[PDB]
Amino acid sequence: NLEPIFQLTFLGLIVLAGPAVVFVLAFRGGDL
Amino acid sequence: RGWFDVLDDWLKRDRFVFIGWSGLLLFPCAFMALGGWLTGTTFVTSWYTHGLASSYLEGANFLTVAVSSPADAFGHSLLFLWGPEAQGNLTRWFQIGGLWPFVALHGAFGLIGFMLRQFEISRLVGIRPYNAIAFSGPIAVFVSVFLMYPLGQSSWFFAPSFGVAGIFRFILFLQGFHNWTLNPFHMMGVAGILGGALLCAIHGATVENTLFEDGEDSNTFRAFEPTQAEETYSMVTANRFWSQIFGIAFSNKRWLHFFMLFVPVTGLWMSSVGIVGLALNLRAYDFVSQELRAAEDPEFETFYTKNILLNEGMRAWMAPQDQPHENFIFPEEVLPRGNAL
Amino acid sequence: MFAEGRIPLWVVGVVAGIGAIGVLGLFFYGAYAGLGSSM
Amino acid sequence: SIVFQIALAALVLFSFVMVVGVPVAYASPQNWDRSKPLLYLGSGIWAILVIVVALLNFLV
Amino acid sequence: GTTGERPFSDIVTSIRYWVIHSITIPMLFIAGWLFVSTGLAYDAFGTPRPDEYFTQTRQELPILQERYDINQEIQEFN
Amino acid sequence: GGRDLPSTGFAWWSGNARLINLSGKLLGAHVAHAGLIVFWAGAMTLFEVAHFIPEKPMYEQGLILLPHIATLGWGVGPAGEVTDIFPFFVVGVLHLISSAVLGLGGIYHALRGPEVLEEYSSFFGYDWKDKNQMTNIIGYHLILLGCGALLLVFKAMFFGGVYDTWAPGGGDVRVITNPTLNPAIIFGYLLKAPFGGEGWIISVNNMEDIIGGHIWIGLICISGGIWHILTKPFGWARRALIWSGEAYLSYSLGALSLMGFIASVFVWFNNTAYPSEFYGPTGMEASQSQAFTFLVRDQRLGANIASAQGPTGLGKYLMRSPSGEIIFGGETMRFWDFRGPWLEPLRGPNGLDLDKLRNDIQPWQVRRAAEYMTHAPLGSLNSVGGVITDVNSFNYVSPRAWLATSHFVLGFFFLVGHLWHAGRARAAAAGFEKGIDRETEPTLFMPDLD
Amino acid sequence: ASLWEQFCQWVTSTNNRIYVGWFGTLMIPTLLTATTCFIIAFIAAPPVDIDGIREPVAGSLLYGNNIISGAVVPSSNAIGLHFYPIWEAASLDEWLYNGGPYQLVVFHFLIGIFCYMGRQWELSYRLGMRPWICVAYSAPVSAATAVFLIYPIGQGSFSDGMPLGISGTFNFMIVFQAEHNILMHPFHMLGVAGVFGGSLFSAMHGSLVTSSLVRETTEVESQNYGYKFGQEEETYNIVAAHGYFGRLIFQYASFNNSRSLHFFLGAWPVIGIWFTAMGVSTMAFNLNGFNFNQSILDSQGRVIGTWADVLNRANIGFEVMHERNAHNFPLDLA
Amino acid sequence: VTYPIFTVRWLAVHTLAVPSVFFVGAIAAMQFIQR
Amino acid sequence: KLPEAYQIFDPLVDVLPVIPLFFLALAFVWQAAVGFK
Ligand code: CLA
Ligand code: CLA
Ligand code: CLA
Ligand code: CLA
Ligand code: CLA
Ligand SMILES: CC1=C(/C=C/C(C)=C/C=C/C(C)=C/C=C/C=C(C)/C=C/C=C(C)/C=C/C2=C(C)CCCC2(C)C)C(C)(C)CCC1
Ligand SMILES: CC1=C(/C=C/C(C)=C/C=C/C(C)=C/C=C/C=C(C)/C=C/C=C(C)/C=C/C2=C(C)CCCC2(C)C)C(C)(C)CCC1
Ligand SMILES: CC1=C(/C=C/C(C)=C/C=C/C(C)=C/C=C/C=C(C)/C=C/C=C(C)/C=C/C2=C(C)CCCC2(C)C)C(C)(C)CCC1
Ligand SMILES: CC1=C(/C=C/C(C)=C\C=C/C(C)=C/C=C/C=C(C)/C=C/C=C(C)\C=C\C2=C(C)CCCC2(C)C)C(C)(C)CCC1
Ligand code: OEX
Ligand SMILES: [Ca+2]
Ligand SMILES: [Cl-]
Ligand SMILES: [Cl-]
Ligand SMILES: [Fe+2]
């Protein structure tokens, strides 16, 4: 089916969201 | 410079992984043992030796994989790949349990190599070799349990299988058939291990809670320097604390650390002596006086006699599956069991 | 990234840890599917 | 009924955008002049989104 | 305190290590995969496939009993 | 405030200790964590709703939040059958959205808001030594907790009532009209032995007592809130206690450990605030049900269960408790204190009544006993139900088991945390939390013990 | 000044050979009570009807037990979790027959050990120490509380508490395995790691310190006399021990900070024991070890055994025999 | 600067890591075997 | 299950509750990016 596929897409977007925030702050020079 | 000394120089170089002469024995043998165990638990079955699946390939998990002991039909055959059983056929060698002696023997020689490494490095750096002496404990356990016990028994089949649930099976087997808990030598082993853990905990905590104020941070870890000459914690305060709490205390640091070595090592050695006994079925199975009294007096019950009954039940119910080569056939009506259960 | 020519070590750590978490998740998923799943 | 699904997906997309932006906006004092109003704006919009969804729950 | 070799952090933060390994590591992963998925592991190690634990003529455990002739015994077990 | 070891004296792994004196940053951390709590509530509720089969009992489906909502009287009717799935969904949604708001506020305070609040406002600024301000915050929060208790009371009285498993005609959502304000009962609950047959407050067995105790709790909490707003700690309290942020944390940790232990016991034993309709049987209930199931079966087969002696000479089906009551035989003799709505119609003044056992047992009671016996809170860590020697085909672990185990573990580790922080708070107040000063090592000025 | 102040000064005095303290004012009476009763009962208690089936079990030496088989027997299953003090028995003989000594001893012992942990904190405070030895002690206390209090509570009877005897301990363990599969419980696995590793680290630390002792003696006298009580100079060479160990495994795996090393020595067994205590405490609520019975099926659907199935056979054998007369109904729920 | 690439350490690293990754790929593949 | 209008985002509700685990992980990620100062 597609339930694991959709589930994994949501999970991966979530997994990236946090590290993406940290990486953007580190690269653009925001306070950390 | 003779070739021997040139080799000695190369082997004893200061590198990330010290090799030494002992490494010649340790590293290939340790690698064989570890890779054999991983290979067996990943790919190799026990279907023909035990009638059991024992690898990830068959659906088992970390808790249920094992390099299982070889078939009981081989007695104490060393089961070389080129031996008369497998005759050089690697697949058959896997199927008959050749991996068990492979892992056991390479591990025994890797253990030898590791203790030789302890000796070699101690000699090179210029310290006393008490680490090797301490490691003799694990060596005694490995020799007694993985070599001496099965050699006393009918075959390697009754050796512990190199797996988590295999070890648990060995443990329960020793309880049910040998009453190993009742064995005074196991009792001394238990005392040694529990006392070693106690000593570890209490010493670590005592040191951490009698530290000297040597820094300004709430983080006291950065107030130590490995080259500092002075004690980093107060032995005097520690001694007073434990004297008033427990009644007695260490006053000699050297004695304390020697005791921390002595306790678990002595425990391992005593339990190894007990296992040697069990290899010959020389068990501390029973207290004859209580057995006789119970056989005559049907009102006499102790926790000892209860444990005997548990052992009887375990043997009868487990033997047919645990010893499939025996073709034990126990009809349902001969199985011992309590009421309603 | 923040410095040219090298990867930050923490970026490498995050990626490797995500991969390790993924392999562990795959093994735990496999405990419930296929062989060894009791079904 | 498809408008309800569209509003739901919009709310999830804007919640993702918010989850990403809000910590960066609060953690960049230098670009705080143009990210303080956006904050306001976005919050309002997110609020509006929730409201729409709620109403559409009873419309669908 | 370094015995001579390059520090690991240096190596694994370098571009070249990753150009090499973004290939080598997945290649080994998928080689192990294929080793399993082609059935090669079953044949190499003699491990039964799920349909070969029992046969239409042997319904019981194929426990070895012979001390030296295990090849024939295994082949008769199938 | 610094954000590294040299300027704070705390390592990264103790980095939150850096917040002890940054009141605004600490408020941000607290609000963001509250957001995490509310987020989990909402997300877990939505997950459970999504994974809910509304005609299969809740306890068979790994649900711990939906039973809480059902017990409150939302979405359930007689015997606990799920009427409307929408209230569960609304509770989950509301928590999720407010969690978003709480997280935003916590992030604001932790990341951009003022570092400390004391020079911005006297009302929200606080100092740990400010005994008056600390008691003011206790007072505000005591008022809020009293409000929450009265919210439960209002739901039970005027907003549809709560689920009463003891309801006549069958357990059902009913409106509590006569809560017991009688202080004798309410506070004699607190005086009952924490042992078998008494069960200190775990033994509360009727929604009237629960609602009346909550009315009392609301009044006590609100009056204590006002008391602490308008007073400062007395001399005895000032002399006995440590007055510091870590000390207050340690006190709360002790409190939390106590509460966690109590909740684990509560869910394990109590079937009133935790109806077995939603949480499944208690272990005691399941044992009693097995005894009842086989009493009924053997009686239908013709066994005279009154006079049948078992192998030991005690009655197979019935026996006496040590105080004389007629109870189920077998090992379940230990569980004779059990009371459940399906068993009490057969209990007389002396215990189990032979006449009711012989001609009052209903088919629904037989069905309930079978269900409860087969859902005994026994199960493996990988959720294989039954006794541990059973095989893999029954995927069940009681919610009571999950809740009791988790809350016992949390209670213990919060006792450990209390010990850690109480010891540290004392040592820091006395000024030796960083080690023994070599110059003034106290033991060196102490006489030798012998 | 006042009589109360003088008493306070006495109880909290760091000059007492044994520190008393406020926690001591509870520890000492309760521990002495538990000890006196334990000795008397172990020697001379009559048999106890542990299973509540009028099948009394002889625990004391005078009734035919040796030291290994003797025990203070847990109170009767008929009592369950009821409070059974001496004054609730019609006679001392009744109290003894139903296992009252077990309850007396256990309750006093548990009060005493919690007060012992409090007393450890108290003395560390009086001596100006850091306060966390009692935290390490909370691991054994947690385990003892699990086996004497929490497990009986979850199971609904003090009859299911660990007996106060050697063979009784073994019986407890065997039945616990039969009913909960503790071996296959990861918290017990962590406890085993805790104790095996604690012994490993004890041996390792002791051996490295002993190996790196500074020469201060001759080959005739004990090297222990090289250390003098109350010296600040270090009695061993930690840098030489680090050199050895970092070459035994590799450099970065060896501690060179004694403080971090001793923190690790404290933390490892303590955490392991906390986990195994929590394991016992949660199996008290019958959340048992892993059950992989019949997890592996062949393609047709026949079960292929694993070592877990063999372990289950052993567990069943233990289970069907335990308390052989106590069960009337087919499921061991209580 | 300019350290050797291949060493005894390199060999000790790979001797373990390389079969480890191969085995992990094999076990991953195992996860999707059906009976 | 979820009421009918919402079962397009069933696979998102399936993963929502584990998010606080990721926050705990993100704390360590952030500390790793700052070099664990
Ligand atoms: C509930 C968990 C929690 C919370 C609420 C906090 C909160 C805080 N910590 Mg912290 N910490 C934690 C766990 C937590 N910590 C853990 C587990 C560790 C061990 C790894 C630490 C170790 C630690 C150290 C070493 C320090 C702190 C510090 C701080 C404070 C400053 C934060 C900062 O400036 O860094 C900035 C980080 C960022 C800007 C990265 C982005 C973070 C954002 C908030 C991510 C949010 C994502 C979210 C999905 C977006 C939703 C927004 C909206 C749409 C809803 C702050 C109040 C510092 C301090 O004490 O200040 C003096 C400090 O030095 N902590
Ligand atoms: C316990 C939680 C808590 C506490 C103690 C504070 C405290 C503070 N906040 Mg903050 N905040 C919070 C949560 C909290 N906040 C949350 C969840 C958000 C996200 C919406 C915010 C977003 C926020 C912003 C953007 C700002 C503050 C500011 C402030 C400071 C000034 C307060 C003030 O005078 O405004 C006035 C107070 C009122 C007008 C009272 C209104 C009460 C609320 C809003 C209405 C609802 C009341 C409710 C019924 C009571 C119970 C709540 C219920 C959920 C149980 C102050 C120290 C300001 C600041 O730092 O100044 C420099 C500021 O800029 N907060
Ligand atoms: C979380 C809520 C909360 C908190 C943190 C506090 C905190 C405090 N209160 Mg309190 N209080 C509250 C709610 C709260 N209160 C409510 C709701 C009321 C209304 C009834 C009161 C009415 C009140 C009064 C009249 C007083 C306080 C006082 C105090 C201060 C010292 C009291 C003390 O030492 O504690 C601990 C208690 C003791 C040290 C006395 C010993 C109590 C017994 C011996 C403990 C035994 C308990 C037992 C083991 C547990 C079994 C449970 C049950 C069977 C009893 C302290 C800061 C005192 C103060 O300073 O005045 C401003 C004070 O005189 N409060
Ligand atoms: C409300 C409860 C509470 C609060 C507010 C605090 C707050 C604090 N504690 Mg504390 N503590 C608590 C409960 C609490 N603690 C409990 C219950 C224990 C017993 C275990 C402790 C034991 C403790 C110790 C030993 C120390 C503190 C310390 C501190 C300070 C800094 C801690 C820090 O930065 O965290 C950083 C966060 C981490 C390093 C991450 C820890 C991760 C844990 C160990 C595992 C998480 C397991 C969890 C169940 C999730 C499982 C994951 C699974 C999926 C794999 C800080 C003020 C330090 C201190 O004393 O400061 C002066 C310190 O040394 N605490
Ligand atoms: C009180 C807390 C609690 C309780 C009682 C439950 C109970 C349950 N959950 Mg749940 N959950 C929780 C919190 C809780 N959850 C949290 C915080 C999350 C966010 C991650 C979730 C997300 C979640 C999902 C997605 C699912 C569940 C499911 C379930 C059911 C199956 C349980 C299971 O097999 O898990 C397995 C057991 C384990 C994995 C063991 C966990 C052991 C931890 C690591 C203990 C930590 C030890 C200690 C605290 C370490 C710190 C100490 C330190 C000092 C060293 C069950 C009723 C399932 C279900 O059936 O849905 C309907 C399901 O799919 N939960
Ligand atoms: C058999 C044999 C042999 C040998 C071999 C070898 C030696 C090999 C090998 C091998 C190997 C050597 C393999 C390996 C492996 C591995 C693995 C299988 C792994 C794993 C893992 C994991 C799973 C991990 C996980 C984790 C954890 C849990 C923690 C944290 C995270 C991580 C992820 C890290 C020869 C040929 C000689 C001959 C014949 C016989
Ligand atoms: C500060 C800090 C921190 C912390 C943080 C936190 C703690 C947080 C949080 C937060 C939060 C707490 C959040 C949140 C959120 C939420 C959201 C964002 C939401 C939403 C929404 C939505 C979108 C929904 C939707 C839906 C609906 C409507 C219903 C149906 C279903 C669905 C889901 C679809 C850390 C540690 C990192 C570190 C650094 C510092
Ligand atoms: C709602 C409810 C109810 C009610 C309840 C109540 C009414 C309650 C209460 C309660 C209370 C009213 C409580 C309490 C508490 C207390 C505590 C918990 C305490 C304490 C203590 C302490 C902690 C102290 C300490 C100390 C000492 C000992 C001395 C020195 C100083 C210090 C502070 C350290 C009932 C059951 C009816 C039913 C169910 C529901
Ligand atoms: C409600 C909702 C939402 C929200 C979400 C959120 C709220 C968020 C988030 C998120 C997050 C919050 C994420 C995260 C993450 C993470 C991660 C993935 C991590 C990690 C990792 C690691 C692997 C680490 C590692 C390490 C360690 C720990 C050791 C050392 C260092 C290192 C770094 C190596 C959305 C929008 C979806 C949509 C709608 C619904
Ligand atoms: O009591 Mn001593 O162990 Ca506890 O599981 Mn039911 O109960 Mn009797 O049968 Mn098996
Ligand atoms: Ca779904
Ligand atoms: Cl027994
Ligand atoms: Cl029974
Ligand atoms: Fe030491």
UniProtKB/Swiss-Prot annotation, chain B:
Residues 43-97, 152-179, 278-341 are lumenal, thylakoid. It catalyses: 2 a plastoquinone + 4 hnu + 2 H2O = 2 a plastoquinol + O2. Keywords: Chlorophyll, Chromophore, Electron transport, Iron, Magnesium, Membrane, Metal-binding, Oxidoreductase, Photosynthesis, Photosystem II, Thylakoid, Transmembrane, Transmembrane helix, Transport. Disulfide bonds: none annotated. It is found in: Cellular thylakoid membrane. One of its GO terms (molecular function) is iron ion binding. A plastoquinone binds at residues 203, 250. Residues 1-20, 121-129, 207-254 are cytoplasmic. This is Photosystem II D2 protein. Pfam families: Photo_RC. It comes from Synechocystis sp. (strain ATCC 27184 / PCC 6803 / Kazusa). Pheophytin a binds at residues 118, 131. Chlorophyll a PD2 binds at residue 186. Fe cation binds at residues 203, 257. Chlorophyll a ChlzD2 binds at residue 106. One of its GO terms (biological process) is photosynthetic electron transport in photosystem II. One of its GO terms (cellular component) is plasma membrane-derived thylakoid membrane. Photosystem II (PSII) is a light-driven water:plastoquinone oxidoreductase that uses light energy to abstract electrons from H(2)O, generating O(2) and a proton gradient subsequently used for ATP formation. It consists of a core antenna complex that captures photons, and an electron transfer chain that converts photonic excitation into a charge separation. The D1/D2 (PsbA/PsbD) reaction center heterodimer binds P680, the primary electron donor of PSII as well as several subsequent electron acceptors. D2 is needed for assembly of a stable PSII complex. It is a multi-pass membrane protein. Belongs to the reaction center PufL/M/PsbA/D family. Its EC number is 1.10.3.9. The chain crosses the membrane at residues 21-42, 98-120, 130-151, 180-206, 255-277.
UniProtKB/Swiss-Prot annotation, chain E:
Belongs to the PsbE/PsbF family. GO terms for biological process: photosynthetic electron transport chain. It is found in: Cellular thylakoid membrane. GO terms for molecular function: electron transfer activity; heme binding; iron ion binding. It comes from the Bacteria. Keywords: Electron transport, Heme, Iron, Membrane, Metal-binding, Photosynthesis, Photosystem II, Thylakoid, Transmembrane, Transmembrane helix, Transport. With its partner (PsbF) binds heme. PSII binds additional chlorophylls, carotenoids and specific lipids. The chain crosses the membrane at residues 17-38. It is a single-pass membrane protein. Heme binds at residues 16, 21. This is Cytochrome b559 subunit alpha. NCBIfam families: cyt_b559_alpha. Heterodimer of an alpha subunit and a beta subunit. PSII is composed of 1 copy each of membrane proteins PsbA, PsbB, PsbC, PsbD, PsbE, PsbF, PsbH, PsbI, PsbJ, PsbK, PsbL, PsbM, PsbT, PsbX, PsbY, PsbZ, Psb30/Ycf12, peripheral proteins PsbO, CyanoQ (PsbQ), PsbU, PsbV and a large number of cofactors. It forms dimeric complexes. Its cofactor is heme b. It comes from Synechocystis sp. (strain ATCC 27184 / PCC 6803 / Kazusa). InterPro entries: PSII_cyt_b559_asu, PSII_cyt_b559_asu_sf, PSII_cyt_b559_CS, PSII_cyt_b559_N, PSII_cytb559_asu_lum. One of its GO terms (cellular component) is photosystem II reaction center. The gene is psbE.
UniProtKB/Swiss-Prot annotation, chain F:
GO terms for biological process: photosynthetic electron transport in photosystem II. One of its GO terms (molecular function) is metal ion binding. SUPFAM superfamilies: Photosystem II antenna protein-like. Binds multiple chlorophylls and provides some of the ligands for the Ca-4Mn-5O cluster of the oxygen-evolving complex. It may also provide a ligand for a Cl- that is required for oxygen evolution. PSII binds additional chlorophylls, carotenoids and specific lipids. The chain crosses the membrane at residues 26-48, 89-111, 133-155, 211-230, 246-266, 402-426. Keywords: Chlorophyll, Chromophore, Manganese, Membrane, Metal-binding, Photosynthesis, Photosystem II, Thylakoid, Transmembrane, Transmembrane helix. It is found in: Cellular thylakoid membrane. One of its GO terms (cellular component) is plasma membrane-derived thylakoid membrane. It is a multi-pass membrane protein. [CaMn4O5] cluster binds at residues 331, 334. InterPro entries: PS_antenna-like, PS_II_antenna-like_sf, PSII_PsbC, PSII_PsbC_sf. Residues 1-25, 112-132, 231-245, 427-450 are cytoplasmic. One of the components of the core complex of photosystem II (PSII). PSII binds chlorophyll and helps catalyze the primary light-induced photochemical processes of PSII. PSII is a light-driven water:plastoquinone oxidoreductase, using light energy to abstract electrons from H(2)O, generating O(2) and a proton gradient subsequently used for ATP formation. Required for correct assembly of PSII. NCBIfam families: PS_antenn_a_b (TIGR03041), psbC (TIGR01153). Belongs to the PsbB/PsbC family. PsbC subfamily.
Swiss-Prot record, chain H:
One of its GO terms (molecular function) is iron ion binding. Keywords: Electron transport, Heme, Iron, Membrane, Metal-binding, Photosynthesis, Photosystem II, Thylakoid, Transmembrane, Transmembrane helix, Transport. It comes from the Bacteria. Heme binds at residues 9, 14. With its partner (PsbE) binds heme. PSII binds additional chlorophylls, carotenoids and specific lipids. One of its GO terms (biological process) is photosynthetic electron transport chain. Its cofactor is heme b. Heterodimer of an alpha subunit and a beta subunit. PSII is composed of 1 copy each of membrane proteins PsbA, PsbB, PsbC, PsbD, PsbE, PsbF, PsbH, PsbI, PsbJ, PsbK, PsbL, PsbM, PsbT, PsbX, PsbY, PsbZ, Psb30/Ycf12, peripheral proteins PsbO, CyanoQ (PsbQ), PsbU, PsbV and a large number of cofactors. It forms dimeric complexes. Belongs to the PsbE/PsbF family. This is Cytochrome b559 subunit beta. The lineage of its organism: Bacteria, Bacillati, Cyanobacteriota, Cyanophyceae, Synechococcales. The gene is psbF. The chain holds residues 10 to 44 of 44 of the full protein.
